Amino acid sequence: FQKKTRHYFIAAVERLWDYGMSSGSVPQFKKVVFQEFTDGSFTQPLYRGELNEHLGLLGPYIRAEVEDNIMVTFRNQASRPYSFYSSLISYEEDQRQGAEPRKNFVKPNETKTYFWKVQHHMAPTKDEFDCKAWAYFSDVDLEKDVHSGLIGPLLVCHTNTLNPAHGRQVTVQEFALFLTIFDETKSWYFTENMERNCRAPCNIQMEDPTFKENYRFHAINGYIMDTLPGLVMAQDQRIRWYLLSMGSNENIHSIHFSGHVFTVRKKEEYKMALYNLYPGVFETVEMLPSKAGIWRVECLIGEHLHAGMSTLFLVYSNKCQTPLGMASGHIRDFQITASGQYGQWAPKLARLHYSGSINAWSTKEPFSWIKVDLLAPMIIHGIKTQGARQKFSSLYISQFIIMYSLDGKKWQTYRGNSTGTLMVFFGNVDSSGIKHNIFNPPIIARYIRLHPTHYSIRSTLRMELMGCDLNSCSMPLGMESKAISDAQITASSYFTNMFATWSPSKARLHLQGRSNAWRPQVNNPKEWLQVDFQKTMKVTGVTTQGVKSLLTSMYVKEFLISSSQDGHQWTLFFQNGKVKVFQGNQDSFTPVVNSLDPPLLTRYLRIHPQSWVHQIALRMEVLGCEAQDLY
């Protein structure tokens, strides 16, 4: 096991503070932020990924293990020169100096690069959590350069907790939360008061009841209207929260998550419902959000809530009603086929809460619709629907009907309990109208279409889906555990000599050896492999794989299946038309989630290889359980 020197090419820039949701006179603001770049040539802006856009109006994650190396090659791009600073900023030694100028000052366009061993000083402990949380900010003016906008998160981890995949994730999913109450008597704000809001209609309110951030700013980042974006999480994969309050001396914030509870470590771990964040106290706390649906975080402090903390988070993942995954789903799943167009396109990006200007679905089309392949027959209990925000335009969909297909071929409309002819659904009312519709009787589908019945400026949408699975026996039938005896499987024929016996009794999803899989005596498509269940079974699908023969690769590319009740005559598998051309392997290893449209009820299952790689070679497994026994 190794140590790593992990640099982070990072800088400081500006743009700032948007509101446009639903709740147009909106103001420009021009505060400073940290920003992660791509290399020394400070060019690639390093697009903030869907996985960390919650971070939003503060800086990128900087992360390390115990016996590690942290490095920051930093460029300032601004007016007032700023700097990097946190606690373990372990400077070094001494110098021929004049009372030790240890002053960190980073002038615009200059590059101040610093890097240091991260001792067990900064590390979390055996008593603690898998990772502790620390702040970095500009120390040029720690007072102003915090309302200005140089808040930053820093994570320090136990050894063997991160990945090749960057960051960690061993049942993780982390989020930071940055609760301040920003104010502009701080940082260059002069270049805002008479930069915008004033021309020849000016000279109105100097510092009398004007309070422009105690007119607004109650941060949970600075996407902190009463709604910030990226709080996507799986209703299990237990989520760690990084709460760090900052600001001034009224900046106590007491946060909680409705209908959820979390555990905090210290001496031990004791269970808590809300946490008085203090300024300078960098909390880590974890929870297991086993209640599906759509919630929020709020600083419970009366007057704070009532000017910006009611800031949503969504859980999708099962019991049963979780978000079906639109934050936690499928990067660019499914969309339409002509219905939907406006440069800033359709889905691709039409999810709930998706922050930005290029955000959601968008079509000035009297005849429209969008389509989600749930990639499996699913229960859909409801649909949270919301709208977007334009130039100064409020635009959304006001009315909609919902059609679904369980199959793809023949569709039809919907008729939520005893309505009339057709189930008319009520849309949004603004650019943040999360109007969680529920399906009165539920819906079982694979595909859902949404069709507008009236729009604002454009048929315009962003949405999540409510529900969860039916729960078929997606559990290994006994090929792996070998609950199915070596006796219990024959094949069409087996290859055999002296240095090998590739008998059918070897076809096992992961099996090592000299002869570690099934092989036919020669290579024919009308060749097969047969499982015999000593009883009557129900099947989801067969997991296929090839063999690593130390010789060459061997695997099966395409196959067929056949079923029987008698075990001597065979009714084979079909699509909605001809036989099922099965999408099989491509390597010595790697298995295949290959399942069946009509769950096959049988007792005699036969594999029918069609196309292969070098020889026909099979390590495999069946998924399922059983209905009644034989009759």
Partner: protein, 630 residues
């Protein structure tokens, strides 16, 4: 089991002749019929509702008010068909009706405790949680909607049918009748106080004497408004992390316990200057009982209270009208590096109070470093050598009695009362027992202090401060006593408000040139003497010498600088307080806390505090680090 609580919410008229609200009723209704548990400690309180780990509670609220009012929990799980919190959680038609009970409505409530929200393996037997109401969070609260809601392991109905427990719910709460449901002319709205028991008001009951009493304490308000609560006996549950004084903020609840001595209804503070006048109080009648039908050290201190002069900023000075610092000291003519006449504790060699005790020019104003492990006895022999009379009392120990007798100075109710005039000396005995020292959890040395108590700060502010250290047992045995235990060192965060000092206008005939315009009571001059400092030293005045690879404990406290709290700094350095590692210490005005530090970051470091509105009003020092020798 499966528990039901059929109780709605009402409008009621309140008192102790000023102010009438909306409360949270208690009653056995199907309609509107009386039903009361409330007599004692229950103030404005929806009934303390208790459910165990595996249970399922059903509140059904009947609303009666001009108010649209909700019901919403914390610390518990439920379906989006409760929550009781309006905002677009998508929620179908019937899933939002829990969110706001339209005025004079009626709604059922679906409440669950799962395993995942029961209390953790080792902590409070029973968790502190409250039940709120939020439609208009600010309104619903200040008005008067709040109750206690408790949750704990498999056995209340069964192991409190057979168990004995002395438990109350104290609701430390700050309703503001200007933020009520409610809206020439001279007398605008007000309140600020415990359980709803105002000013000095007192509630009800007590617990038995020879054992322990548990209180689920719920923090309240509609603003960032911190308190700091006390009474006699230590208040040792936080975890079994073992605390000087319950310290409550915005919205706070964890749950704590204490022991007892006898009948003395013990005094119940909010103990801060600002909250005081309009503050919180209640008694505690600790009575007799129903249910019966390498040894220990001996320390010595000769300390005198004694008048001297204090230059807060000697080393460094550079004023004119050139700064906010330039303004400090005597706002008439005199205004350079700032000199006042103070009275600080100072210890002598022996009864012959003659031999000057060599000083610790790092502790500045601070008294001699007092220390005593559990089991020891402090014989503290104390002379006044300042005219205007004072005394000595340690916030920490409870067994403090005059040396030889168990008398009370001929007349007074207890020593922190009146005693010691100019000249006269008193022999005090401080005996320290396990109860006032640390534990198998804390550090090994909790931080405390001694003030004088003839006047409170009209004393203290004038210089009466010194650090008291109570500690775990050890001597060439126990833990860490094989080559050396590296020395003890104290920082004191203190605003001295000369404006109150028992040397008030004494000091104006002094340093200030001419009272030929004897001006007093002023906007800027009052601000001109509020001295935000660490050990009297201010504005990077005498810092501290240390070196790298050196390692020892810091003991720190907030005193005199009140009305507020202190998040505290240390540039680039990090400490192990509470056996975690944090970089900033949050400190109240009781605030005794004890950190530990590996000194190995060479350079100037600007120790101050994480609040950047005093560290400009002074309130900063420096620290230096560089290799040593030995």
């Amino acid at each position: 089991a499966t528990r039901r609580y059929y109780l709605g919410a009402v409008e009621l008229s309140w008192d102790y002749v000023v102010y009438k609200k909306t409360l949270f009723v208690e009653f056995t209704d199907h309609l509107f019929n009386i039903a009361k548990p409330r007599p004692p400690w229950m103030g404005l309180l929806g009934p303390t509702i208790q459910a165990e780990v595996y249970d399922t509670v059903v509140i059904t609220l009947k609303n009666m008010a001009s108010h649209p009012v909700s019901l919403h929990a914390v610390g518990v799980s439920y379906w989006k068909a409760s929550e009781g919190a309006e905002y677009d959680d998508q929620t179908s038609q019937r899933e939002k009706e829990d969110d706001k009970v339209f005025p004079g409505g009626s709604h059922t409530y679906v409440w669950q405790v799962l395993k995942e929200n029961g209390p953790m393996a080792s902590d409070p037997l029973c968790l502190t949680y409250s039940y709120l109401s939020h439609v208009d969070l600010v309104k619903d609260l200040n008005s008067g909607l709040i109750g206690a809601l408790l949750v704990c392991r498999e056995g209340s109905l069964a192991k409190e049918k057979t168990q004995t427990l002395h438990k109350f719910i104290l609701l430390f709460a700050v309703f503001d009748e200007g933020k009520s449901w409610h809206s020439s002319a001279r007398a605008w709205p007000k309140m600020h106080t415990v359980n709803g028991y105002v000013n000095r008001s007192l509630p009800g009951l007590i617990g038995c004497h020879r054992k322990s009493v548990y209180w689920h304490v719920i923090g309240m308000g509609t603003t960032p408004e911190v308190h700091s609560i006390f009474l006699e006996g230590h208040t040792f549950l936080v975890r079994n992390h073992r605390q000087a004084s319950l310290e409550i903020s915005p919205i706070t609840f964890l749950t704590a316990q204490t022991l007892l001595m006898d009948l003395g209804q013990f005094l119940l503070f909010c103990h801060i200057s600002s909250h005081q006048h309009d503050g919180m109080e209640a008694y505690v009648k600790v009575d007799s009982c129903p249910e019966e039908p390498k040894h220990p050290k001996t320390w010595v201190h000769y300390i005198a209270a004694e008048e001297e002069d204090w230059d807060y900023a000697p080393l460094v000075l550079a004023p004119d009208d050139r700064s906010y610092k330039s303004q400090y000291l005597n706002n008439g003519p005199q205004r350079i590096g700032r000199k006042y006449k103070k009275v600080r504790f100072m210890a002598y060699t022996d009864e012959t109070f003659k031999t000057r005790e060599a000083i610790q020019h790092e502790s500045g104003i601070l008294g001699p470093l007092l220390y005593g492990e559990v089991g020891d006895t402090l014989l503290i022999i104390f002379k006044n050598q300042a005219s205007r009379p004072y005394n000595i009392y340690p916030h920490g120990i409870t067994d403090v009695r005059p040396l030889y007798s168990r008398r009370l100075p001929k007349g007074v109710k207890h020593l922190k009362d009146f005693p010691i005039l100019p000249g006269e000396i008193f022999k005090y005995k401080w005996t320290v027992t396990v109860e006032d020292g640390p534990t198998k959890s804390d550090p090994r040395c909790l931080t405390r202090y001694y003030s004088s108590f003839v006047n409170m700060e009209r004393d203290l502010a004038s210089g009466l401060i010194g650090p008291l250290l109570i500690c775990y047992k050890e001597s060439v045995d126990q833990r860490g006593n094989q080559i050396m235990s590296d020395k003890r060192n104290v920082i004191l965060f203190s605003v001295f408000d000369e404006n109150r000092s028992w040397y008030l206008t004494e000091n104006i005939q002094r340093f200030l040139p001419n009272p030929a315009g004897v001006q007093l009571e002023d906007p800027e001059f009052q601000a001109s003497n509020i001295m935000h400092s660490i050990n009297g030293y201010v504005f990077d005045s005498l810092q501290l010498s240390v070196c790298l690879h050196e390692v020892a404990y810091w003991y720190i406290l907030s005193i005199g600088a009140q009305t507020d709290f202190l998040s505290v700094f240390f540039s680039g350095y990090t400490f192990k307080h509470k056996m975690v590692y944090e970089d900033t210490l949050t400190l109240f005005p009781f605030s005794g806390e004890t950190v530990f530090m590996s000194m190995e970051n060479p350079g100037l470091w600007i120790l101050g505090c994480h609040n950047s509105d005093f560290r400009n009003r002074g309130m900063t020092a420096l620290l230096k680090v560089s290799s040593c020798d030995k």
